[PDB]
Design a protein around this ligand. Sequence first.
Ligand SMILES: OC[C@H]1O[C@@H](O)[C@@H](O)[C@@H](O)[C@@H]1O
Ligand SMILES: OC[C@H]1O[C@@H](O)[C@@H](O)[C@@H](O)[C@@H]1O
Ligand SMILES: OC[C@H]1O[C@@H](O)[C@@H](O)[C@@H](O)[C@@H]1O
Ligand SMILES: OC[C@H]1O[C@@H](O)[C@@H](O)[C@@H](O)[C@@H]1O
Ligand SMILES: OC[C@H]1O[C@@H](O)[C@@H](O)[C@@H](O)[C@@H]1O
Lengths: 109, 112
Amino acid sequence: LGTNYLLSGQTLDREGHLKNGDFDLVMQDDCNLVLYNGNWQSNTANKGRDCKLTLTDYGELVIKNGDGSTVWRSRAQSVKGNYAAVVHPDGRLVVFGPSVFKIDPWVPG
Amino acid sequence: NIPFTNNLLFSGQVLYGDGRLTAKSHQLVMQGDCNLVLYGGKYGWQSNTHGNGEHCFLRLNHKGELIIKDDDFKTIWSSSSSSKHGDYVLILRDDGFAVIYGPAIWETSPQA
Ligand SMILES: OC[C@H]1O[C@@H](O)[C@@H](O)[C@@H](O)[C@@H]1O
Ligand SMILES: OC[C@H]1O[C@@H](O)[C@@H](O)[C@@H](O)[C@@H]1O
Ligand SMILES: OC[C@H]1O[C@@H](O)[C@@H](O)[C@@H](O)[C@@H]1O
Ligand SMILES: OC[C@H]1O[C@@H](O)[C@@H](O)[C@@H](O)[C@@H]1O
Ligand SMILES: OC[C@H]1O[C@@H](O)[C@@H](O)[C@@H](O)[C@@H]1O
């Protein structure tokens, strides 16, 4: 979790959100993912409680409930690699990936 | 054009003249001296292209290439990482990594 992206492997929890401008993806109470001002939803209300939003090794967005079941998949697939779901400022949620380049300020020059 | 977000650079946008990505404890700055420098980290990063050119600017394209051009469009530096043609982004992540993800495989709705 880091404000406007969810990297693959990260989890957006109940009440957790991604914000860019007048835009807000909330992982809501009723297991519904609503992208406010974005006219979009997972459209999975009440289909769970205590749910969680995840991104796969393959760049798919998945929602599981409190129990453990997949409740929505984005259905899109690409290769094994790193991915970022990002809140574009136009108001879309986009899954980018896989990683194609890395700058590492921890290992030396 | 595309509105700015301090930690992203989508294919198309162009930083120059000490423009920068800013995240948590880091900055990746396309400086005035034609050197692209990530600040912070344990060691940080540069492309060492200091003085190599005038009025240089940075731009991630739609093939996944993040490039530095000078005012005459001479390549000064490439991320040298061309891949599938589509929409790319460069995140300066909160963990310090500048990473280029792409292309785009899924959306809530289309651009225009
Ligand atoms: O597209 C989802 C929309 O659903 C509506 O009923 C409300 O919840 C709106 O706030 C939301 O934008
Ligand atoms: O579930 C696959 C697709 O179905 C659509 O109706 C929307 O819910 C999209 O957000 C989703 O990507
Ligand atoms: O900042 C330049 C901007 O000019 C505005 O009037 C719009 O056309 C935007 O799409 C563009 O980004
Ligand atoms: O203070 C910033 C300066 O850092 C120096 O070491 C140079 O390498 C330049 O790239 C830069 O202008
Ligand atoms: O069609 C998708 C469009 O996405 C936008 O953000 C820009 O990258 C356009 O250049 C691109 O064509």
